[PDB]
């Protein structure tokens, strides 16, 4: 068969935006190995992943109906990455004229920067398991249609989705920017093995803007 086997639990908290909901729907279509489950402490995501026999979790956490976080883990032993998602533009939107097969296997493009530090090297491997499509998953389709790219600019991970034309590229969406917040040893537990000192919560940011 093949060595690379992946099943990802795709789940969110209560309170996700319309825009948040659209991205979940976008990833669900783009990732035929994802299993979208009813909404969700966070340690209880290890049991739910065992219920649906998933070896990865993509958990989207919404706060105050506006801030979206992505928790990426390997249940039940970890590790866990927590990202803050910004600059979200779903494939819905006007200027995205790319289209691709629902369930075809993407090419993944990674910045050389992912090889530059141990926390980026661990994230890179984890993004492959989750955002790659395993060969040849149930609900996957043949032919190579599109690329998902990851680039490190101002130490944030910028994500784009391009359709392959013929060879030129045309954007599909979704489109967003992740900034690493922390990395936990375990799966929604265990000690923090990484912290971004440059991260600041959007609630603090909104407040410092009020303070003028």
């Amino acid at each position: 068969q093949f060595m690379n086997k992946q099943r990802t639990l795709l789940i969110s908290s209560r309170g996700v935006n319309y825009r948040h909901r659209h991205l979940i729907q976008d990833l669900s279509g783009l990732l035929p190995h994802s299993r979208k489950e009813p909404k969700l402490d966070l340690q209880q995501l290890n049991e739910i992943a065992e219920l649906y026999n998933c070896n990865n979790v993509l958990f989207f956490e919404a706060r105050k109906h506006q801030d979206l976080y992505l928790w990426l883990s390997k249940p039940p032993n970890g590790p866990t990455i927590k990202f803050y998602i910004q600059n979200l533009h779903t494939m819905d939107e006007l200027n995205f004229t790319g289209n691709c097969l629902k369930g075809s296997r993407p090419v993944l493009s990674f910045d050389q920067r992912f090889e530059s530090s141990p926390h980026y090297q661990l994230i890179k491997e984890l993004l492959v398991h989750n955002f790659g499509v395993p060969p040849n998953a149930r609900k996957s389709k043949p032919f190579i249609d599109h690329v998902m790219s990851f680039s490190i600019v101002d130490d944030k991970i910028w994500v784009r989705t391009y359709e392959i034309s013929h060879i030129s590229l045309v954007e599909i969406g979704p489109r967003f920017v992740m900034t690493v917040i922390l990395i936990l040893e375990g799966s929604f537990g265990g000690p923090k093995i990484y912290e971004n000192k440059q991260y600041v919560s959007p609630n603090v940011v909104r407040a410092q803007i009020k303070q003028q």
């Binding site: 289209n99 993407p106 090419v107």
Partner: protein, 99 residues
């Protein structure tokens, strides 16, 4: 707070052995340059998208050369009609076309 030893161990526990198998397992291409040149201003839209575009298109030519060598069909046929991520009405309306 940057426990590099544990992140190194986490990578080794968790990574799949890609070198022992074929490119088709992962279909992922890492760039040689940092995509950090190609951007004079981190806050200029058209500049950074061009870099992103370049990194991705470079990864696609590489990927096609490898999947060709492996006899894995690559380009979506113009006459293969399966469920797309966007509907055809959605594509035609975004282009202002008559349906």
């Amino acid at each position: 707070v940057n426990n590099t030893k544990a992140m190194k161990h986490a990578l080794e526990r968790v990574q799949l052995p890609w070198k022992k198998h074929s490119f088709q397992e992962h279909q992922s291409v890492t760039s040689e340059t940092n995509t950090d040149e190609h951007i004079k201003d981190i806050y200029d839209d058209t500049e950074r998208e061009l870099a992103f575009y370049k990194q991705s298109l470079d990864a696609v030519l590489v990927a096609r050369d490898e999947l060709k060598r492996l006899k894995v069909p690559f380009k979506r046929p113009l006459d293969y009609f399966a469920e797309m991520v966007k509907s055809d009405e959605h594509m035609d309306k975004i282009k202002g076309k008559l349906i």
